[PDB]
């Protein structure tokens, strides 16, 4: 018990802190794992880093049980909360010697979260900026400066993000998220890689089943009937169903199990646009995106049909240009469907699977970018504005918690710090220098008096400089950050009141 | 701050020695001499001029106590107790986490209460007769010598002191100087044979006893003149002859006849030299039938100087009858089987420098009774200095803890923490005091505490001397407000001197 | 080796600072030092302190040696020196560990002390009479050394004697040797006994009263140094005369230059006396040549060990020689010499280390008067002048950007050492303090500092708390250096055997 049960404490999350102060950023170091059985592995992700971390000592097991939580419950946030506490419990560890007594110490870090929640609330920036200016193309380009396209992805990053510009949707009563699984891209070996084109809406895979059918149809407001059952000789029934079309009045026709001779002849002579054998998902994403309803089987009570005004949907426009070896149908737009589509060009469809690799992380990335609306300064802005506005906020208590207040933002630099270390570059300029430039954005900008005072500059990791990560596009969620420094003094608070330890 | 707890804990080795000491009926020490020699005694004076003890702030706190014995003489464990029970009480506080700046600040400001409050009870004895002057001073001496031998012939000790100081002292200037007092004693005869002298005893035979032991006054002439000189009795050898040897032997007694007729001349009676006298020289001075004095010591020699206004004669025709010192009468006084053939120097009167004689059975017997005299002498000299005296004796440090305790109850901040500590340290003394007498530890302090408010303010102090009642009047324990006044002053400077020590850096030698 | 010999030396050098930090203060704590020669000192006084620590370590042999210059430099502010110095290596510990090199750590060091130094002299203020009475100039600042002390009652009395006192000397010429204390036992506080110029107490170890009178309204102050007492079967006088006539005449060789007062550093007894009583000189041994120096400097006379070639030119005259029983002893003073600028104090009190009390305590009020009138320029005492560099220093690292900015934000927190062991030795809530007068000082208030009557800051040119500017320049300069010699040190070589 006493400053031996607090010497220990502090030792053992230190401990823990060296096994992920290296892994923090992107160019971290890895770690290698070990176990009695012989098996070994090496990685940087920090939960599975904690959740095969072995501790001993019974102080890490609270320190790694929530982070733990933090990965369960949120799902990242897993190292900043050993790295955020380990420096707070090290600096609490110099107020105990200063004659600062454990409860003190916890009742000011609960006031400091009080103000920071205010100050990053304050501070934090929406889902917006990101059109017409290079917020998401730099943050697309993040994730492709790593594929072969790379040196192209100032024409790749543009579709990625148009693209996903007009695929807003509701979601669950109005959330405003985009779909994962949309703008049906076609890998093709079309042209050179920088020709790939955009387009202005949705293509189903897919063709006018016959060349001599008419490929636009209803160029105002369309009807689109879904059938599966096909209209193949089993004649002139499955020919009749094309009657049935007629009548029923399906302007643009998905039947997905082909097409009798006659019945590719009858949608000519009917003046209706036939289509067969489309992707099934694509269909059923045709069916919210038109709403043509895929038929399995005609029963309704023995209806034989596309069931007039029943199974069709509605869409604007629907056209199929012709692109230089690329035939395929284009849906305009609708009353909802939040649809678009890409044509890929370059060297080959092997080539083009690097596209199919850089767009399945691209378009995931770029929409987790956008997936939380309140977005957060990355690269130690939210750390490092937090020490500058905190230390004035050392003024408005100023009593025995202004030397808590001062050492929970001196802590605050642990983030800006290890992602220096880990990055090669010299971490004492660089920390300096980002406090430099986030302590004048207090000063005037607020007072709205400013030449180039903004904030948002931030650590660059590559390029080796601080810069405004707004027009580099480092952003992490304010749910995180939030949520991180609310876990951090869970842990500093549960280690700090640790005060006896029997060994029964 | 854990050195504070080894400073005061070191305090306490200190303290479970001296506290046992305390009191009339207080309990002897072995004093183990480097040579070997068994001491015991009482006074924590001697115990802690020889207590050799290798804390360095023992070594301070003995240093201070030294102060006190060179200014009132008697209060020596009291400032040792006082300081330990201050240190005791100061251990508390600093566990209860005060600054130790803050405890010495709070034992200053308590401490100015009590020095006024033993103001209240201050009398003086001088107002009063000459006659009652030296009856309460005799009343007060016989209590100094209770833990004495003297315990039998108490009263034969104690009417010494009343013109043993008095006729050293001046009763206008009221400044008696101790100095001008001798203790001269000898291991042997009986604590009986003990007298006060008016003057100096030598304790020198004149050389041998045909030389005359004595000078009459001369029909009350000039005083009988004393020749004190540096020099033996005799002059500051290749025979080829007999008639060279003739005048070998006899240039001693040229020089015998020389300093003799210089004895004549000047008109010195006795001639006291520093070195011895030669078998011829007594001859030379037993034709001319002049006393003379060999082997003196300077300490003697000015006390032939002092009483009788005399000269230290550096040789024998140096001598001028001015420069010789005149006495009353000079004589040879054996007591009982005394062999040592002692001799006495007086003015028949209130002399410049009084001896008192001490005999005593066995060396611890002799060297109680002279320390007694020292202290018990001190005691009407601490009465002479200062005539305000109390009745105070285990009353006084009472009464003022009781005072101290009435001031915490009005205090009410921070000072509680220290008033209500310093009357607790306070009551340490008459807390010693019962223990080291055999009664009740803590039910002395309620009955004293009770006596002194439940019944009235008054002299209610121990039993320990024992006695009937609590009544300090009737047993006339008397001590000085001066000393009283030291005791306490003295005990907060002991308090200040180690709660300030924060390290004892020892270092060694190369 | 390597970067761990620092980590090593600056270890040594915090262990000096923990023994000397309970020092800082009038209110402050002592340290017992025990002495190979076993004369055990216990003082607050850091030069003291410093003389007698007897360090071995290397690292901080260096410490204590720059400490030891500021005392022969200045004289004052030793104490601040090693807080201050040792400081500046504690912060550095957080430095080392990251991988601050010596260069960078030293290069910022010399920035900050040049930044410092500007801002004391922008701090300074230049008293003189500047809002300021030439009495009360010296007066006031004596009185306030000496408030709450054990002589605080008594502060008219030696607050009376203590402005004089240093009044007295020359006031262009002031010299520690010029004020002189002597240990008096015996007597009350208000006792002690001022005396116009120098006095001693009498050594003379042996009788001869009644003869020499001793007391002189013009005397003539002769020094020797040697003896002039003399400590056929009839032929053996002879060589007791020989040797007698021969210092006899010697003792005349004295009465023929003419001495009223006759010194010498050996024992005197009465056998010399035989002819001083007879010609009636005054004669007093095993006197210390420093009081023989100043009656050199006093009457302008000159030690002769002999006797026979000494003529007027050794004789030497004051306005009073008097021997006293004032102190139940005799004393012989001086006083109004013609050539004196000295001055001493007989302090009479309870016990020796009670006139201890009373003598440091005077010593620092002696020293407070002294620069008051050596220094012009004075600067804020309290710590107000290490909170004013704390708050200057603090705004240049908000302008400075680069790892200069880490460094001198540790300069400005080290500042804050010197009222932090202000605060803490004088009792006071140390967390208190130092936030309510860093606040209170960045409202723009200059003159905040520590109040030691009442636990708070206030305004320390008011209270008269004054220290000198160069005190604070020197040893801050001197501090910095220190910090360069330590943090400097790569490798220890010992040439063993």
Redesign the interface.
Known sequence: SGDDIRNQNVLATMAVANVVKSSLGPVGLDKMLVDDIGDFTVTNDGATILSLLDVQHPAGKILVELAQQQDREIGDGTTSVVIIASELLKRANELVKNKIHPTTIITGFRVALREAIRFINEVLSTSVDTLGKETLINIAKTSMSSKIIGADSDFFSNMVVDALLAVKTQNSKGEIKYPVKAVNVLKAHGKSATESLLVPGYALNCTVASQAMPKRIAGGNVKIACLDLNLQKAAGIVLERVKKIIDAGAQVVLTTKGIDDLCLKEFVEAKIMGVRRCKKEDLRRIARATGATLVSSMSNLEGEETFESSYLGLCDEVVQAKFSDDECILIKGTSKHSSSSIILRGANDYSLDEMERSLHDSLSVVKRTLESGNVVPGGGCVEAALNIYLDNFATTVGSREQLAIAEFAAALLIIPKTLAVNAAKDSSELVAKLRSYHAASQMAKPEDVKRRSYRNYGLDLIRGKIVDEIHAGVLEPTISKVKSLKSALEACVAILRIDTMITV | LEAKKSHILAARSVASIIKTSLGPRGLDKILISPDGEITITNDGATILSQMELDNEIAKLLVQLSKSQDDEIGDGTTGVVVLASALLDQALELIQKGIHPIKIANGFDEAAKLAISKLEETCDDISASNDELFRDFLLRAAKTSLGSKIVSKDHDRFAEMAVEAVINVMDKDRKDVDFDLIKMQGRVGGSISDSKLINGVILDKDFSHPQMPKCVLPKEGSDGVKLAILTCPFEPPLDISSVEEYQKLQTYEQDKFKEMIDDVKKAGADVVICQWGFDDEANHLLLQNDLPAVRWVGGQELEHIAISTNGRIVPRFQDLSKDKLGTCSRIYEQEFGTTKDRMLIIEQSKETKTVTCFVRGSNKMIVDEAERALHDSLCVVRNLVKDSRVVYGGGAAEVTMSLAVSEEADKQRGIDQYAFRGFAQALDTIPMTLAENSGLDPIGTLSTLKSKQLKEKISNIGVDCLGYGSNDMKELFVVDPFIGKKQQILLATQLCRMILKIDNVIISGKD | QGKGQIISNINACVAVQE?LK?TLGP?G????????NQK?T?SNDGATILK???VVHPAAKTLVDISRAQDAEVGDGTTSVTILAGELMKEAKPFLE???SSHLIMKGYRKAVSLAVEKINELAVDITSEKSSGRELLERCARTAMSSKLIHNNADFFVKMCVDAVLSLDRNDLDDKLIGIKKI??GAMEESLFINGVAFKKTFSY?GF?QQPKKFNNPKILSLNVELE????????A???AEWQLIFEKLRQVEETGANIVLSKLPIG??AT?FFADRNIFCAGRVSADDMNRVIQAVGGSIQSTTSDIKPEHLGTCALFEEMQIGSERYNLFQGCPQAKTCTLLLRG?????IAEVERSLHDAIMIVKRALQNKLIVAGGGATEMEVSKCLRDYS?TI???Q??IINAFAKALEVIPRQLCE???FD???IL?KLR?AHSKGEKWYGVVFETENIGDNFAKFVWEPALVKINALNSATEATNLILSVDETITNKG
Not at chain 3, 230 to 237: F, G, R, S, T
Not at chain 3, 350 to 354: K, L, T, Y
Request: glycine letters at 8%; charged letters at 25%.
């Open positions: 023994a309970p209110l704590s002592d340290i017992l030092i025990v002495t190979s055990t216990i007698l620590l007897d990251e991988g601050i036992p015996g009788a009644e003399l400590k056929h079967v009839e032929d053996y006088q060589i007791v005369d009465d056998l035989q309870g016990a020796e280390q009670v908000k950007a680069g790892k900015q880490m030795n004088a009792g140390a967390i208190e936030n606040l």
